[PDB]
Paper text:
We observed that two N3-1 Fabs bind to a single trimeric spike with one Fab binding to RBD in the ‘up’ conformation and the other Fab simultaneously engaging two RBDs: one in the ‘up’ conformation and one in the ‘down’ conformation.
We performed focused refinement on the Fab bound to the two RBDs, which substantially improved the interpretability of the map in this region. The well-resolved Fab-RBD binding interface revealed two completely distinct epitopes on RBD-up and RBD-down. Notably, the relatively long H-CDR3 loop (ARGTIYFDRSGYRRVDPFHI, 20 a.a., residues 93-99,100a-100j,101-102 in the Kabat antibody numbering scheme) engages both RBDs via hydrophobic and polar interactions. For the RBD-up interaction, contacts are made by the Fab H-CDR1, H-CDR3 and L-CDR2, which together bury 824 Å2 surface area. In contrast, the N3-1 binding site on RBD-down overlaps with the ACE2-binding site, where 11 of 19 N3-1 epitope residues are also involved in ACE2 binding. The sidechain guanidinium of Arg100e not only forms a hydrogen bond with Tyr489, but also contacts Phe486 through cation-π interactions. In addition, Asn487 and Gln 493 on RBD-down are expected to form polar interactions with Ser93 of L-CDR3 and Thr57 of H-CDR2, respectively. The angle of approach of N3-1 prevents ACE2 binding by both trapping one RBD in the ‘down’ position, thereby preventing exposure of the ACE2 binding site, as well as by sterically inhibiting ACE2 access to the bound ‘up’ RBD.
Numbering used by the authors:
A (entry chain H): 2 to 35, 35A, 35B, 36 to 82, 82A, 82B, 82C, 83 to 100, ...
B (entry chain B): 338 to 359, 366 to 380, 394 to 515
C (entry chain A): 337 to 358, 365 to 517
D (entry chain L): 1 to 95, 95A, 96 to 107
Write the structure that this text describes.
Amino acid sequence: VQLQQWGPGLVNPSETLSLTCSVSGGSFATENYYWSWIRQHPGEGLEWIGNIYFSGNTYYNPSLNNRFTISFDTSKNHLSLKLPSVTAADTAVYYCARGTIYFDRSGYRRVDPFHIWGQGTMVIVSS
Amino acid sequence: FGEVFNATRFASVYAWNRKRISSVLYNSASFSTFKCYNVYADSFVIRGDEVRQIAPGQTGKIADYNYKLPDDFTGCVIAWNSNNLDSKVGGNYNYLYRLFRKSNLKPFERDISTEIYQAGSTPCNGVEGFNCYFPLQSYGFQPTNGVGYQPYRVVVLSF
Amino acid sequence: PFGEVFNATRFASVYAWNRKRIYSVLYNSASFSTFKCYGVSPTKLNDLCFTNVYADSFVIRGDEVRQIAPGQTGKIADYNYKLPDDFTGCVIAWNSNNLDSKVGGNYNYLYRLFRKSNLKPFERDISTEIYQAGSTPCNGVEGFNCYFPLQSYGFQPTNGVGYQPYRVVVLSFEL
Amino acid sequence: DIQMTQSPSTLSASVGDRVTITCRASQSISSWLAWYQQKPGKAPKLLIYDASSLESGVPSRFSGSGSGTEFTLTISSLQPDDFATYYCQQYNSYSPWTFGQGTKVEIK
């Protein structure tokens, strides 16, 4: 399996950003997996944006002021990120990943860390 | 009738409105669906595929957690496509619908609470987590979706 | 009768996994080293009924236990065993160092290697076929790049915990 | 809510030396921690999970141990390909997930 990304490289200092990620050799319709978006500022650590699950449920990072948005497109089997009113501090690399969900012997529900990563995408705010 | 049919904005399905009062509707070809089975009008927005759930006896997410009609309903249901008013080039996410709840709704019942839904076994004290979901979700409307995924405006009269 | 499966003495090799057709005793035990279920909860298994219940068992190296999962990759997953992307069942495994470990090595259990095409979910390939090679025909070990398509494990009484043998059984449910 | 702290920020070593890295948490976590490696200008990859479980395909010279609030990553013998940046991440179920600050290794 491989993941590919598509996005714009330049953006105006006040516009809407739109990225897209896809998969090959598999399918999104499965209750066994989950997807997420990570970003990394130049010369800095990583940040976690949020998670999206099968059946349309979502979970976001409280630290961010819910500026981001994640949604599927079953007509194309894509996943996209939406961010309106971009600013100077939005220049970074963006990644899409996948994980796994399983049940424990005691009956609880646990998760596994990310193990598939995309190639990343770089975006700059012009002026 | 002009105010209800020609208003500028409609309420979300989970927060439908109420109205009471004390020709064009019949002849107009703009109403794609028009079937009739104290007056109280209603209004909200949903997807075209969910229009069939607004009827006596249907089941589904909309009929179970958002809006319910009694079996002995006496009224008429009217709906028309509004893709050229409720869509946006960049996508609109201003409409919401409930997705999780402990039990179904009763006829003509409204729910506005926004508490955390406690899935799983261990309880959560009002803090969202991996096993405690937010009960409200958002719709996605774009000018290029199929007719089944376009927005629709619904008005249901009850007598 | 799960005792016939969870308490047998002779087990099969991974390339020729054995299939059988048929709960508190399972999830109340503490001997099992790994216990993971996908799509269902072990505690709720008594509240459901199914038409089909299959049991598969084999032996693999301890380090390769992670390969028995949906969406995994590796020699075992690519050429020996493969789970669907929407599997529904449980995977059970435990250490078996007290058995299948003789002084000097067993060399009994085998595993396939150098296959040309990946396997489909729930299938086995047992026949010894022509040896994987380059552009020159080979009917033995006459080619310097020619290789026999099977290999044998080297379980011994003393080795790293990662190289010790493990017994694994997989349960599947379908209605 | 939860936070981490890595130390040292930068480390210098040579082939065959011993290296240890420590990831500390603000509150107890029941072994839900993982370690990543990132080469310059490339996507990360997973090395360890559950604080003690080795990932498929990674060399055996990597190891990790600890629980509760202290964890350690140890390399038995550095190879020329082991010079990179490493991060520790936790995936607790009661709080948002977060990454560490990262540590860098170079040749002495």
